[PDB]
Design a protein around this ligand. Structure first.
Ligand SMILES: C[C@@H](c1cccc2c(-c3ccc(CS(C)(=O)=O)c(F)c3)c(C(=O)O)[nH]c12)N1C(=O)CN(CCCCN)C1=O
Ligand SMILES: [Zn+2]
Ligand SMILES: [Zn+2]
Length: 232
């Protein structure tokens, strides 16, 4: 009823949307992995009379439900999707998207990692993102490669019309004490990568993590802190 959705308020097998700004929504879904349940976020950005999707809803059925929720709530066609790293919470559902006619994109790094992992593989490669600090435009967003963090391939997404920074899994929510699933992380580089985000997007007004509640710029420093404490 207006609060940011959580696993306790999303019915089984469903997806919820949350309005972030004019023409900007997050999507929230839940999934189980290794016998625990987790929420995860993605982004939807209006692109004229079409939509740009950032990240799947973590699974084929969740991603089908995401498409249905978008049709119900927004009613504009999703024409393109970008996955911000190779893990299943970002690419699981790309096959659903592709069969629905959505053009799916990721960096070449992400596409290689997804293929090697046995995860679903976005169709189109996003060049111009291979060095830390690189940025490219993609419809109504800027894509930015901050360096290795949660994963070596993680991208961040900025919506300049609204000053919305979608950090993806390189950014944690404020209530976190721990640094999430670090299996593929670079804990030593992660703070440097966060510093690059802070320097590039100093006017961000909303910061959205890959999992959990959006907030402000504090999520960036908080993430650096939790990562350093984990490494320690
Ligand atoms: C699919 C993905 C994955 C699964 C389960 C949980 C998470 C989490 C995660 C987020 C927040 C918290 C709460 S908190 C801040 O308080 O800790 C948490 F507890 C875990 C993250 C994330 O941090 O973004 N991602 C996860 N994922 C990986 O990321 C690495 N991996 C292993 C490789 C599998 C290859 N097929 C995996 O399955
Ligand atoms: Zn991940
Ligand atoms: Zn994640």
């Amino acid at each position: 009823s207006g609060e940011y959705p959580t696993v306790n308020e999303i019915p089984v097998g469903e997806v919820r949307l949350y309005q972030i700004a004019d023409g900007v929504w997050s999507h929230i879904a839940t999934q189980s992995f290794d016998g625990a349940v987790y929420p995860s976020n993605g982004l939807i950005v209006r692109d004229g009379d079409e939509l740009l999707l950032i990240d799947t809803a973590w699974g084929a059925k969740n991603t089908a439900a995401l498409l249905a929720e978008i049709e119900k709530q927004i009613g504009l066609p999703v024409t393109r999707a970008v996955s911000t790293h190779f893990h299943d919470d970002r690419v699981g559902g790309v096959d659903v998207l592709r069969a629905a006619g959505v053009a799916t994109y990721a960096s070449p790094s992400t596409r290689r990692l997804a293929e090697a992992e046995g995860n679903e593989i976005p169709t189109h490669s996003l060049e111009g993102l291979s060095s830390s600090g690189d940025a490219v435009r993609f419809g109504p967003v800027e894509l930015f490669y901050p360096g290795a963090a949660h994963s070596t391939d993680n991208l961040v997404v900025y919506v300049p019309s609204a000053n919305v920074l979608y950090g993806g899994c390189a950014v944690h929510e404020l209530s976190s004490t721990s640094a999430g699933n670090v299996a593929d992380a670079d804990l030593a580089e992660w703070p440097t990568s966060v510093e690059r985000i802070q320097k590039h997007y100093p006017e961000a007004e909303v910061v959205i993590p890959g999992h959990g509640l959006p907030g402000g710029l504090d999520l960036l420093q908080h993430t650096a802190n939790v990562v350093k404490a984990h490494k320690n």
